[PDB]
Design a binder for this molecule. Structure first.
Ligand SMILES: *[C@@H]1[C@H](O)[C@@H](O)[C@H](OCCNC(C)=O)[C@@H](C(=O)O)[C@H]1O
Length: 433
């Protein structure tokens, strides 16, 4: 007995165009201690990335980038590791955001590392260097003293920028690689707008706010809306686009029973669209090893698997790129966590991404504004919102090496230019007209 809601696709309410390199993952720089990880020999992980997008961005940084030390002969990055990363990026078709050690390393070491990266990976595949991860939190791990402020950071950033550009005159940069805030990200954009390609921000649905639950994770985040508005103002005031270079559901590798659940797939897929509709250039979900929130879990020795969050990213992958249209929801007060995104695809077909994040309400969606004859739906499903497994998209799990294709396509009940789509509570759908 579903909530009956109306969705009006207005193909004339033009939103932002989703770039083809929108999707991405964030990893710890420490993973590069192991040259077998980001390697042309790591076909399994390479396969998982190709499935998330023919283009995308691998971001390497995180808290371990303050403890990772480049050497041409505490974790150590070797020329072998950088050489193997170039071969990895060749197998995936993805571009690279590469963190440099501004926390504990020297300008001269960062310049040397940046030179070897540009020499091996090249200007086409290297999107940006980043000078430190979350510099606003250096003072909390003692990487800097408590007195460290934006002024001190700007001094450090300039010293590193100068040293790297002497070795790498075409070196591209992004920063400041943390959450939107007025004490760091606004002044950074103002001072360094001529020295960076784009602004890099982070976002965790968990706050410092009450404890994170599946219930909480499905609701709007006023902090997210605030931070996104901040980044749009910085883009208006400076011309700098923004990318969400580190994101996931909960901090410290995630929360067992939230981050590792089917709920995370609905949250992650919806987030991708909410940020793309705000004009974000892209996203990088943080992950690695077996962390609770990792899209892809595993190791080269034991192999890799898609975790539930991966399936939300997979729905985005299958929607593909294009321009977002108006998709207005009515009669939805009793089903308020249903979200919907309409997309004019690059191939000229209309697509709708629906996230029924209501944990108790089934919906009946009356779709108008699509003058196409017919549509098919691929469902994003698990039997409970807190399932750690049993997740499918298009009636299939993702297999070894990111192997996926749909096994259940279901024609959409259509008649007189109106379509009716049923969705279970805590489910997602991709409609292709
Ligand atoms: C952003 C940080 O830059 C990340 O280092 C940090 O990840 C920590 C756990 N690592 C993994 C691979 O699971 C992340 C977080 O707190 O989860 C953010 O603080």
């Amino acid at each position: 007995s579903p909530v009956r809601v109306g969705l009006s696709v207005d193909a004339s309410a033009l939103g932002h165009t989703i770039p083809p390199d929108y999707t991405g993952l964030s990893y710890e720089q420490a993973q590069m201690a192991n040259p077998n990880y980001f390697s042309g020999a790591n076909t399994q992980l390479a396969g998982f990335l190709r499935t998330l997008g023919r283009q995308g961005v691998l971001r390497i940084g995180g808290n371990t980038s303050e403890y990772t030390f480049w050497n041409r002969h505490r974790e150590v990055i070797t020329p072998e590791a950088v050489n193997n990363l170039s071969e990895f990026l060749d197998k995936t078709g993805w571009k690279l955001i590469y963190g440099l050690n501004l926390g504990k390393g020297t300008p001269e070491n960062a310049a040397d590392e940046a030179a070897y990266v540009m020499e091996t990976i090249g200007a086409d595949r290297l999107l940006a260097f980043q000078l430190g991860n979350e510099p606003d939190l250096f003072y909390r791990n003692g990487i800097r003293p408590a007195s460290y402020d934006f002024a001190a950071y700007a001094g450090d950033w300039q010293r590193f920028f100068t040293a790297i550009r002497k070795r790498v005159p075409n070196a591209p940069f992004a920063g400041p690689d943390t959450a939107y805030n007025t004490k760091w990200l606004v002044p950074f954009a103002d001072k360094f707008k001529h020295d960076v390609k784009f602004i890099s921000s982070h976002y965790y649905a968990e706050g410092p706010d009450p404890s994170m639950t599946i219930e909480r994770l499905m609701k709007p985040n006023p902090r997210l809306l605030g931070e996104t508005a901040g980044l749009k103002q910085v883009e208006a005031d400076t011309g700098l686009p923004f990318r969400l270079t580190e994101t996931n559901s909960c901090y410290q590798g995630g929360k067992q029973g939230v981050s590792d659940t089917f709920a995370a797939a609905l949250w992650a897929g919806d987030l991708m669209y909410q940020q793309a509709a705000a004009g974000s250039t892209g996203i990088n979900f943080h992950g690695g090893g077996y962390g609770w929130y990792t899209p892809v879990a595993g190791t080269p020795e034991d192999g890799f698997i898609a975790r539930p969050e991966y399936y939300g990213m997979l729905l985005f992958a299958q929607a593909g790129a294009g321009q977002l249209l108006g998709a207005k929801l009515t009669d939805n007060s009793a089903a308020p966590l249903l979200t919907a995104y309409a997309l004019r695809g690059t191939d000229g077909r209309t697509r709708i991404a629906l996230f029924n994040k209501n944990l108790d309400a089934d919906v009946e969606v009356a779709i108008s504004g699509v003058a196409s004859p017919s549509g098919t739906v691929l469902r994003l499903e698990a039997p409970r919102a807190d399932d750690t497994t049993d997740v499918t998209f298009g009636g299939a799990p993702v297999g070894a090496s990111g192997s996926w294709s749909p096994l259940v396509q279901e024609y959409v009940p259509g008649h007189s230019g109106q379509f009716v789509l049923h969705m279970r509570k805590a489910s997602g759908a991709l409609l292709e007209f």
